[PDB]
């Protein structure tokens, strides 16, 4: 039932389903009380298209809750290829820029900071780019400017929860997944009492940020490689965070901007207080 092979038999579109079952579907044949196996708390099964409506109806009745439906063939092509991003290409802006040296930087900051969503030409931050070109600001300075912009506020903040925002923030600004439940919490409390702007500053003035990017380096991916003071399970979070080269942050998804890192998963790396 778990992770599948194949798609169809006569022909179908197999969908794999996931639920949470009562002892009504599955119980042991024991002398007392009806219980399902504790590890099949959420169970998944792959069903071809016709049997599918009948299965969902049954599951819902006897008590289960469907958690997901997704085609099997989507889910057979693995996990993302990460070769492009295991070790990236760094882009850094020099002291006397060359006229297109600076062109390189802007295109990359865009891609990285905005998480590969398209920024259309009406959309670009032109006045701010003027500034970088003249040297009035530096690459880190410019990077902070994009984050406080409406375009950044609008595709990533306004329409999703704070859990999601912060998780995106780590990916964009720091290039790495969020290590702890404390990190999520520490941030949510800051936004709540100092506002959005103070909270944005907190990733860009951090010691972690400063070491790796310094000030003239565009933030680049770095979570597919071992880092310091990183729990070990933050390397699996990175797969959940980045879905491949053609994937992007996208707020235009049918289901909306949502999570990607399970809250249960974060707790595995440690729980304390505050």
């Amino acid at each position: 039932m778990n992770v599948l092979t194949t798609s169809s038999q006569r022909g179908g579109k197999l969908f794999k389903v996931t639920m949470t079952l009562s002892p009504a579907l599955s119980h042991h044949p024991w002398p007392s009380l009806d219980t399902y196996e504790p590890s099949q708390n959420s169970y998944s099964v792959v069903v071809p298209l016709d049997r599918l409506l009948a299965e969902m109806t049954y599951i819902k009745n006897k008590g289960g809750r469907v958690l997901d439906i997704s085609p099997a063939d989507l889910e057979a092509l693995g996990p993302p290829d990460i070769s492009s991003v295991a070790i990236p290409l760094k882009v850094e802006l020099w002291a006397k820029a060359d006229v297109s040296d600076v062109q390189a930087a802007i295109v990359a900051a865009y891609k990285q900071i905005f998480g590969n969503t398209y920024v259309l030409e009406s959309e670009r931050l032109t006045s701010a780019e003027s500034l970088l070109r003249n040297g009035s600001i530096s690459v880190r300075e410019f990077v902070r400017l994009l984050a406080k912009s409406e375009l950044y506020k609008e595709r990533f903040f306004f329409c999703t929860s704070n859990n999601r925002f912060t998780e995106l923030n780590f990916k964009h600004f720091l290039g790495r997944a969020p290590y702890n439940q404390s990190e999520i919490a520490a941030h949510l409390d800051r936004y709540q009492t100092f506002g959005y702007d103070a909270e944005i500053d907190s990733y860009i003035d951090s010691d972690e940020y400063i070491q790796a990017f310094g000030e003239n380096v565009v933030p680049y991916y770095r979570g597919f490689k071992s880092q310091s003071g990183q729990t070990v399970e933050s390397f699996n979070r990175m797969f959940k965070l980045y879905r491949g080269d053609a994937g992007s942050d996208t707020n235009l998804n049918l289901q909306g901007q949502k999570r990607r890192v399970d809250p249960k998963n974060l707790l595995r790396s440690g729980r304390g207080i505050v």
Binding site: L131, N134, S136, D205, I210
Partner: protein
């Protein structure tokens, strides 16, 4: 020119122009060799808002570069 243009998108209130002798606080070249920064980044003029003035200075000193000047931005 780092001759600040406008308010340099800092918004906020007053603008202070602070120059520091930064070491590799910032700008280590991505190169294999020894965490240097370009030679002409010995003094780093930078304009910050009044609200962000204190935090920045704290992390400049903390990372070792020393402030060389401070003037109100205008």
């Amino acid at each position: 020119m780092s001759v600040l243009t406008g308010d340099n998108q800092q918004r906020g209130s007053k603008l202070f122009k602070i120059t520091i002798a930064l070491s590799p606080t910032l700008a280590h070249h991505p190169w294999p060799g020894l965490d240097t920064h370009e030679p002409s980044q010995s003094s780093y003029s930078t304009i910050v808002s009044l609200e962000r003035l204190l935090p920045e200075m704290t992390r400049i000193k903390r990372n070792g570069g020393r402030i060389l000047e401070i003037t109100e931005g205008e």
